[PDB]
Design a binder for this molecule. Structure first.
Ligand SMILES: C[C@H](O)Cn1cnc2c(N)ncnc21
Ligand SMILES: C[C@H](O)Cn1cnc2c(N)ncnc21
Lengths: 313, 300
């Protein structure tokens, strides 16, 4: 009965996520912790050409008024489905090896990932919807495709003052503060959504309360402070006023996929070593899982090294 | 704890696919209005514009990819809400028989693979859709069609959907994809290992040759490294495809006959389909509710 610890580092770009996780990985034994890094190689080359470059210019040309909404939406939608592929595929090959949950002895293997599938099938799409470059229907199609949430899905979101974030961000993608505001808002919403569901929130019961951040602590947030609030869009509403059932079912799925997640908030308003040690203290309350076969440890380990080996920076 | 029989009627369109049995119809209203405006027309116009040289290959692919997301949404949301109610295999007549108009693989693999063959979708986008195919649950019975090509052209010509353009090149492509699909399931069911037979594509139990399966489509140069090796991320996606396809139960329905005949042939095929148990006492009625509400809201 060997155990596994899976930790997905996620949240808005530009906070220091990659650095903190390399630092955490650099403390461990080469063989008891493996990092699944950002698939930069799939991105700029393998899946398509310069994927991040096509996105930031299309929104920039949508702002100006050089290309309509529909035009930007088709480009944003296809960019996202291609961008999320590595996360989805990783999740699908690992799935069969993950047993039930399980404080406990040291995990036999710790897998740290640069992002979870929900960044590409939920968060980024919702942020683009708020920026006007994606339709709500398309965001819900992404949501309906989120894979079943595996036991022990530990997701680490980040915290950081916007002023420090804007400054960290300005390093050299283009300088898009509106998008920065939109993605921070969506991740704030995401943490509250997990809290809401874990405290027994039923969006169907509270839908009517809509008009006009901690993920594992505190009281139940108001539905207005969760991701459900984004789906009040007239496009999704029938002539009767309520959501078409098709979109309501997607919110049911959103609710199911996030209800079982374990979310932690890491403060990035610190030096790199500071972030590392805090992430390392956080991993202590995270949930481990048993693996289905005995050979899953080495198997999974190989899968992760291969991904790192072929798709990093 | 009652039994359920799920039957997905799929295969290329245009062949004739149009109380204890519920029928989940084609979500035409989602395609023409709820998810977007006239998605079929946008698909067919885009391919037409590419064919005439009015737009680029890259341009048509972004348009196609986005429209395929819209086309697929109803199946994917349907599978996600239904999945939790599906239990293990049971094998007597079933408590409920749910007949669906298409399975998620139509939109997350077949149509996409066919547009890749029409030069309007990248192979990488096709594999992004495949990676998102939902886990194959017990009792996934998929009915595929058989019909000679000229009878199919006749039938399709009398059956055009709103915004569709009669395109014989897309007909051949979708037909080829579906024939490869049937071959692929048999290849996997008889022990075929794509990784072991990959070398047979690039330089030459009893089952189809891998060149006669969907794996042959993924020998696309965009997915290979400079030394000819398939990138691991794509090899992964093929591993998922084998896993999803191997456990489906495919039934072939001969459509070269009358609706009466087809109806009965379809009912005849039901004897070898696999039934499951549901997981709750309220699953039947809830499933039932889902089915009728989908039909009312999204059915033409
Ligand atoms: C650097 C990028 O902003 C990070 N990133 C990671 N996944 C993404 C996605 N699916 N869409 C947009 N940006 C994404
Ligand atoms: C309109 C008919 O149902 C054909 N048809 C059915 N599903 C499709 C898809 N997902 N993409 C393109 N055409 C499709």
């Amino acid at each position: 009965m060997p155990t596994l610890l899976r930790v997905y580092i996620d949240g808005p770009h530009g906070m220091g996520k990659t650095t903190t996780t390399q630092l955490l990985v650099a403390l461990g034994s080469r063989d008891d912790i493996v990092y699944v890094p950002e698939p930069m190689t799939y991105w700029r080359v393998l899946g398509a050409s310069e994927t991040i470059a096509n996105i930031y210019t299309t929104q920039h040309r949508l702002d100006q008024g050089e290309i309509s909404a529909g035009d930007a939406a088709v480009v944003m939608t296809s960019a996202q489905i291609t961008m999320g592929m590595p996360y989805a595929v990783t999740d699908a090959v690992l799935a069969p090896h993950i047993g039930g949950e399980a404080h406990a002895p040291p995990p036999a293997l710790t897998l740290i990932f640069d992002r979870h599938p929900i960044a590409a099938l939920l968060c980024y799409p919702a942020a683009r919807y708020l920026m006007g470059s994606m339709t709500p229907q398309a965001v819900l199609a992404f949501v309906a495709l989120i894979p079943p949430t595996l036991p022990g899905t530990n997701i680490v979101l980040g915290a950081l003052p916007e002023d420090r974030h804007i400054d960290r961000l300005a390093k050299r993608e283009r300088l898009d503060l509106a998008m920065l505001a939109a993605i921070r808002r969506v991740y704030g919403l995401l943490a509250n959504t997990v809290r809401y569901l874990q405290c027994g929130g039923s969006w169907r019961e509270d839908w009517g309360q809509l008009s006009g951040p901690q993920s594992n602590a505190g009281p139940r947030p108001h539905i207005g402070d969760t991701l459900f609030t984004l789906f009040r869009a007239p496009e999704l509403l029938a002539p009767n006023g309520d959501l078409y059932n098709v979109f309501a079912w997607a919110l049911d799925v959103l609710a199911k996929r996030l209800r079982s997640m374990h979310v932690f908030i890491l403060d990035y308003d610190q030096s790199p070593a500071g972030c590392r040690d805090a992430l390392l203290q956080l991993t202590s309350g995270m949930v481990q899982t048993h693996v289905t076969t005995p050979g899953s440890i080495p198997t999974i380990c190989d899968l992760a090294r291969t991904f790192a080996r072929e798709m990093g920076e």
